[PDB]
């Protein structure tokens, strides 16, 4: 429900330790939780806004030059001097013209010249820093209710949208029928602001690095500045043409709007149009589940004769979704759904919409369950008029675990150490692989930075070759963790 059909979602089973589980959820993915009890839920971020921004440094995309005055003087007599050189709107350059009697000075030497031209921006581009307070994630929680026409249902009032901040608290949600659920989240560790500059073009916006935003070659001007005319690095937007040794002239240098839309390759786009809405990054959330009523206990079973009203349809990751409908009397009741096999003894193939329930009306319900990797019977009731639907799920033998190995590794490529916060206190193994991934990813971070798509692959080839020639058992040291991992990182970047 609202997760079924979204690509690259993931499942978590287990509330072990106490009654909690650690999940980290991006804007794209949609994590689904399961337990031995404790009805299933669907979480994902929908929105992340920075509330109150403040400008850091305004740059200058496009300028124009007016009021050109030049001044040139005799050879071996000092330098020129002009009244508008005192002002700092004007841009200036000293250079050498050659002079003689035809230029009316004497001495036949190479004299001085200045040229002034005042600088006027007409297209700004400002970036706005925000601190890791006062920013408001919004996380939506939808249980697998089996409510009618609500599956793949990214719209519509069907779940609970709770808005968490670091100003906020436990932020518990009483999603009705099933009880309350509390999310102890960390809205500071994840996206790592105070290196982010919420850049802004005319009608666009990006999330760029701070230190990248500071040293751009455009003429700039400090953030809090009314009368924005004292541009500081004006030398990189005008060029001084002194073609021969005759006099010189000034020209402005176009628009770097398109020249910066190439510079913003690799920068993830955000939306600063009405509120600074971001759609990037993750949010680690400890989820404890000790007050989840199941909404369907204390109800009796059915008497049978269902009616499948929408065809069984598998999704990605190999889970069917059916839609049945009760016929009869005694309508608030459970559903005798079970998947089993040929020869009809072994119950195999579990559920994801655990305890399906007919919610007191003639409203069709939605059941998701994971069949086995071959032929299977999917039984939707009891002996007077049950539904034995046949099904075959493709492949899924050892291809499933070699698929979730690659997808877990790409979760370790997109996320950093936070991909070890996907389970619930492994302890002896998880809490130490977290730290070893923080030091291997730490000394990997103070290297390979600025290095592109291709050059990570190239350094992977180099370390692979040096490992494949070196001796004293450094082959496994130099291929496994560096010589191959930097090739896989060399493929799985430039998202």
């Amino acid at each position, epitope marked *: 429900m609202r997760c079924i059909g979204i690509s690259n979602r993931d499942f978590v089973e287990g509330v072990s330790g106490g009654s909690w589980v650690d999940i980290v959820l991006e804007h794209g993915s949609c994590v689904t939780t399961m337990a031995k009890n404790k009805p299933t839920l669907d979480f994902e971020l929908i929105e992340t806004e920075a509330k*109150q921004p*403040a*400008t850091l440094r305004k740059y200058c995309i496009e300028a124009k030059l007016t009021n050109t005055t030049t001044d040139s003087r005799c050879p071996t007599q000092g330098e020129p001097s002009l009244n508008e050189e005192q002002d700092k709107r004007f841009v200036c350059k000293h250079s050498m013209v050659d002079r003689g009697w035809g230029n009316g000075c004497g001495l036949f030497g190479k004299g001085g010249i200045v040229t002034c031209a005042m600088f006027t921006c007409k297209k700004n581009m400002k970036g706005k820093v925000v601190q890791p307070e006062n920013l408001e994630y919004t996380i939506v929680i939808t249980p697998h209710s089996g409510e009618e026409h609500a599956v793949g249902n990214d719209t519509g009032k069907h779940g609970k949208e709770i808005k968490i901040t670091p100003q906020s608290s436990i932020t518990e949600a009483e999603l009705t029928g099933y009880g309350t659920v509390t999310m102890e989240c960390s809205p500071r560790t994840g996206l790592d602001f105070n290196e982010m500059v919420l850049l802004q073009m005319e009608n666009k916006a990006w999330l760029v690095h701070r230190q990248w935003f500071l040293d751009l070659p455009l003429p700039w001007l400090p*953030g*809090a500045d*009314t009368q924005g005319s004292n541009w500081i690095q004006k030398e990189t937007l005008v060029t001084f043409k002194n073609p021969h040794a005759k006099k010189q002239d000034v020209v402005v240098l176009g628009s770097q709007e398109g020249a910066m839309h190439t510079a913003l390759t690799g920068a993830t786009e955000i939306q600063m149009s009405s509120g600074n809405l971001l759609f990037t990054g993750h949010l680690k959330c400890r989820l404890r589940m000790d007050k989840l009523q199941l909404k369907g206990m204390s109800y009796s079973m059915c008497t049978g004769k269902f009616k499948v009203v929408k065809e069984i349809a598998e999704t990605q990751h190999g889970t069917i979704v059916i839609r049945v409908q009760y016929e009869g009397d005694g309508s608030p009741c459970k559903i005798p759904f079970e998947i089993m096999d040929l020869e009809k003894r072994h119950v195999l193939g579990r559920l994801i919409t655990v305890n399906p329930i007919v919610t007191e009306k003639d409203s069709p319900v939605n059941i998701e369950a994971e069949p086995p990797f071959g032929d299977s019977y999917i039984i939707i009731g009891v002996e007077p008029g049950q539904l034995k639907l046949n099904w075959f799920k493709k492949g899924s033998s050892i291809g499933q675990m070699i698929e979730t190995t690659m997808r877990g590794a790409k979760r370790m490529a997109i996320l950093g150490d936070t991909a070890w916060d996907f389970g619930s206190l492994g302890g002896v193994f998880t809490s130490i692989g977290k730290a070893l991934h923080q030091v291997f990813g730490a000394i990997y971070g103070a290297a390979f930075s600025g290095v592109s798509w291709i050059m990570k692959i190239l350094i992977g080839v180099i370390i692979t070759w040096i490992g494949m020639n070196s001796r004293s058992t450094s082959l496994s040291v130099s291929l496994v963790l560096v010589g191959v991992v930097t090739l896989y990182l060399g493929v799985m970047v430039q998202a």
Partner: antibody
Amino acid sequence: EVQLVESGAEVKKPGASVKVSCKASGYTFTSYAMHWVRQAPGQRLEWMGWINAGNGNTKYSQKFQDRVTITRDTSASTAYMELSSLRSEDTAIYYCARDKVDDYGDYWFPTLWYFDYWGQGTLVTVS
Amino acid sequence: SALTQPASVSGSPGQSITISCTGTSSDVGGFNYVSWFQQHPGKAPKLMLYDVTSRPSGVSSRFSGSKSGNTASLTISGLQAEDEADYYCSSHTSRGTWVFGGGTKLTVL
């Protein structure tokens, strides 16, 4: 416990030199700051006076930069405020202020609770 | 160099009234030097709020202030008959001068 009385002015001429004082008592005058502010009736509080101190420093307010000269004194524990070259809009009510100075002597960083106490108002006219 | 509070507000005794002031990125929206001064028609004004929200002695703990970006709000809960003063605003700027509000007029009927 802190009261700031002033000195009154009867009638002036546009171009003459009005002058207003402030007898401050009940506290230590040698290490606090004294401002002066003008209020046209029902209008904006135009901040006239500057950042006085134990040595009487200045901070040039832009609208009243080349038309006011202020002094002080310590032996009388008062502050001085005189405005030369009046015109037909300077006729308004005056007030005073109070603020503590940093312990190193200098006062550019103001403190959080500025403008603790005020004057009482001495009205000036033109003719 | 000025402040943009509305010239006249009204409200019955019992409801709440708020007065906002839009400042630039140097005087109000950047710094926590935002003060509020009322003025009786026969009395000199007096200090009423500290840096953002905090209060001196004297006034009876009703007035709360806030800063919502470039706006500075003065919340008044439980109006009375002796509160018909001129709630000015104040801000220490970045260069070193003090700016002030134009003026609010308050009634109850």
